[PDB]
Design a protein around this nucleic acid. Structure first.
Lengths: 221, 25, 101, 57, 141
RNA sequence: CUUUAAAUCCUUUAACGAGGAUCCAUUGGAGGGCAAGUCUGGUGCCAGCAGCCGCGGUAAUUCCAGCUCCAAUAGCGUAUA
RNA sequence: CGGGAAACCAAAGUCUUUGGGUUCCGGGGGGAGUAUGGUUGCAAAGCUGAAACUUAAAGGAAUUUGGCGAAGGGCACCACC
């Protein structure tokens, strides 16, 4: 029942030393357990399955069908993720899809439109993503417009906490996995676009590896 | 049926009908 | 198993094929001296074959006298027993499937 | 059998059952509210694909 | 475009006109032959006279006898077959009467497993076929 | 009573006037797109449904009838521009 | 580096973060490079070039068993020496 970790990040988040996962996103440390997310995010992390499809390799004994399951994850205050797991039984494929979506959640920032009043509601710039042959655009919107898109990026943008935007899609958007990954790597690009208010020189604080290393090396071997 | 002999048959049919039209007048 | 010899109805008059054409179409010279292009049913597509010079229980159309529909195909012994009954006349052409006509 | 050219045979030889009593209307203020609260509050679907309101099983 | 001059308008307009002429849906609506060859002559519905009842077969694997009606038009005078829609409704139509025909739903193309038809039957003998099938009305003698 | 060339339409006001308030709300659908039944009985690649995939083979979530249910609801469905 | 559906590409790159300039050319697959009209040519034949009708597929890249009158190996006294 009780969790015992593998890496050092498990000790760092269980010894009441990592206050928030924004430090992990700042230092871009890789994550390899679906349970630091359980520690930092509570019941706000919903799970809704997108699509179940069969994939078939076929041999002399006929086709054997493993099942591919897309799921999209994310709390409604920021972070949103996606994960694809394919196996034979439906339930373990669904559970592995939840786990792999739970690892790869990306933080997002939200901007304004026209005037910078109140809490942010839309994406700050025009960002896109590239995978396969599909295009997903994220155009900022005036307040109260809502998300206008296909139902799958409607689900993704409502789950991510985006109140409103404008989209446009090009290409063979019938393949839902490629289209969902295009939306995922489009919304993950809302950081990687330098804006003039981020122009000042950053300061580097102490890394969490340097923060408690003497306690870390004595609390695990 | 490849395109070479299909073109040859259409050419022969066109030549035959053109000869029949020019000798019919 | 020896099935029961079903009889004709008003629209199931006895007929015999004289020549089979292509395109999945069958043509039979009926016993009333009429010719019908007789269409093969879904059950009779690949499970059984209508060979030539055999009697065919055709299905007539009540609104046109051009096409027929098939009801059932008969084997040789049931055809000979129906011949011995006398429902169909003496000018039938089985003749141990002769090709002369 | 008669022929294969008969029309309306399934319409012809089928059974006949008369109609029943008369239902109540109030222009959708409870006809759809009943199925809404059954779908959203009363009937709780188990984790899976879907669940319908006309499940006669 | 790829011809991108500031004083290039007539070349772009002529190229757009030619490449729009190289089409199918625009060429159907902006040519006289595509409407002249239409049996209705550009009309929605048309009336006709029944001359012969023809029964046609079906296409590949799905095989059934579909029953249609050969109609001669009033405004034009060409024999055009028409498919009676519902179950057992061929008993209503007799020969040498009046029938109202209309399209079946793909803008002038064969639909489903019936080979070589385009048009269905809506009204026969100046009464609706739906009321004849349902039982709300009855064919006058 | 009023309006109006004179009325009818509407507004106003007497006497009547709802408990299956019979003073009776229809149109297309129920496999996927596309909200809504492995319901029952009948013919069982026939009859038919189906704008597209496809359902019809005597275990029909699609045909033909009865029950329930969803959609807009005095409106709804179909065809041609 | 980057791009593409992928084979692949220092160009097939600098493309939703689209805009250096400028000719020809394609809108599902058949019908069909066919008929007619013009034009060129001794002849053969080149150039321009449809429609009616029909169909829900025709096509491009690539992974697993399949099958070779393709090649390369391994094993067996129910194959051989």
């Amino acid at each position: 029942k009780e969790w015992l970790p593998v890496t050092k990040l498990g000790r760092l988040v269980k010894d009441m030393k990592i206050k928030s996962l924004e430090e992990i996103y700042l230092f871009s440390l890789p994550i390899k357990e679906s349970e630091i997310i359980d520690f930092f995010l509570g019941a706000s992390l919903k799970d809704e399955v997108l699509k179940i499809m069969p994939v078939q390799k076929q041999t002399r004994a006929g086709q054997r069908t493993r099942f591919k399951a897309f799921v999209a994850i994310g709390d409604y205050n920021g972070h949103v993720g996606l994960g694809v797991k394919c196996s034979k039984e439906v339930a373990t494929a669904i559970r592995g899809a939840i786990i792999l979506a739970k690892l790869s959640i990306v933080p997002v920032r939200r901007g304004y439109w026209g005037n910078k009043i109140g809490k942010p509601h839309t994406v700050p710039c025009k960002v896109t993503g590239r995978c396969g042959s599909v295009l997903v655009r994220l155009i900022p919107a005036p307040r109260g417009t809502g998300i206008v898109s296909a139902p799958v990026p409607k689900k993704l943008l409502m789950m991510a906490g985006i109140d409103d935007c404008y989209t446009s899609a090009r290409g063979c958007t019938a393949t839902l996995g490629n289209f969902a990954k295009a939306t995922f790597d489009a919304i993950s690009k809302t950081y990687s676009y330098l804006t003039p208010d981020l122009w000042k020189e950053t300061v580097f604080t102490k890394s969490p590896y340097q923060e408690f290393t003497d306690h870390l090396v004595k609390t695990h071997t | 049926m490849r395109a070479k002999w299909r073109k040859k048959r259409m050419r022969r049919l066109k030549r035959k009908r053109r000869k029949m039209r020019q000798r019919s007048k | 198993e020896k099935r029961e010899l079903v009889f004709k109805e008003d629209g199931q008059e006895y007929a015999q094929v004289i020549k089979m054409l292509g395109n999945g179409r069958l043509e039979a010279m009926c016993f009333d001296g009429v010719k019908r292009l007789c269409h093969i049913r879904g059950k009779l597509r690949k499970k059984v074959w209508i060979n030539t010079s055999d009697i065919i229980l055709v299905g007539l159309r009540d609104y046109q006298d051009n096409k027929a529909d098939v009801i059932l195909k008969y084997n040789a012994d049931e055809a000979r027993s129906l011949k011995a009954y006398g429902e169909l006349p003496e000018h039938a052409k089985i003749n141990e499937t002769d090709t002369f006509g | 059998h008669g022929s294969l050219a008969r029309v309306g045979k399934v319409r012809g030889q089928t059974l006949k059952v008369a109609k029943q009593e008369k239902k109540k209307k109030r222009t959708g203020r409870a006809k759809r509210r009943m199925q809404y609260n059954r779908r959203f509050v009363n009937v709780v679907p188990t984790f899976g694909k879907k669940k319908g309101p006309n499940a006669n099983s | 475009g790829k011809c991108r001059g500031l004083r290039t308008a007539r070349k772009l307009r002529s190229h757009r006109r030619d490449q729009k002429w190289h089409d199918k849906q625009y060429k159907k609506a902006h040519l006289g032959t595509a409407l002249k060859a239409n049996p209705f002559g550009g009309a929605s519905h048309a009336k006709g006279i029944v001359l012969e009842k023809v029964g046609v077969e079906a296409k590949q694997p799905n095989s059934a006898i579909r029953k249609c009606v050969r109609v001669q038009l009033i405004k034009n005078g060409k024999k055009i077959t028409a498919f009676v829609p519902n179950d057992g409704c061929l008993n209503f139509i007799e020969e040498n009467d009046e029938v109202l025909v209309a399209g079946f739903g793909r803008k002038g193309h064969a639909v489903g497993d019936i080979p070589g038809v385009r048009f269905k039957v809506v009204k026969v003998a100046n009464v609706s076929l739906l009321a004849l099938y349902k039982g709300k009305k009855e064919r006058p003698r």
